[PDB]
Design a protein around this ligand. Structure first.
Ligand code: LI
Ligand code: LI
Length: 135
RNA sequence: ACAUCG
DNA sequence: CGATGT
């Protein structure tokens, strides 16, 4: 119904899918960029969306912040809830990096606690999520 | 179908 | 138009 302006919004961007993947997190209220991941040579949209949420969780926990996270990704929200990124991407030498980060993100989820609400950004009603790459 | 990525 | 996902 109502946007929770006191929140962190995350989103993936890519060049190709599979292709070059990056992600960022922004203050929903101001659009200030709070973190940005160095481009990863090969990954999928959903792997990047998953990493972005998990990085948001870690970012907020380190800062003792109870703010929620907005994501526009039905897939990644579920993967985080399950603590399991069910990606179809082949595991080979050229995808090793993204899969290492995904495996490490799952490992973090399985060794830490959080209460952060992970909320669906309602693009149809509210427009593009504030972290969108506008591509 | 729904949610995304280009 | 194509790919990633539930
Ligand atoms: Li997105
Ligand atoms: Li986006």
């Amino acid at each position: 119904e109502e946007i929770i302006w006191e929140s962190l919004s995350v989103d993936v961007g890519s060049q190709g899918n599979p292709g070059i993947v990056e992600y960022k997190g922004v203050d929903t209220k101001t659009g200030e960029v709070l973190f940005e991941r160095e481009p990863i040579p090969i990954g999928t949209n959903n792997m990047g969306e998953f990493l972005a949420i998990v990085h948001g969780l870690r970012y907020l926990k380190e800062r003792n912040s109870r703010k929620p996270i907005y994501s526009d990704s039905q897939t990644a929200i579920k993967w985080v809830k399950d603590k399991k990124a069910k990606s179809t991407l082949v595991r080979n030498e050229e995808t090793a990096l993204i899969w290492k980060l995904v495996d490490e993100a799952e490992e973090w989820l399985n060794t830490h606690t959080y209460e952060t609400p992970i909320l669906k950004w309602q693009t149809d009603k509210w427009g593009e999520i504030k972290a969108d790459y506008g591509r």
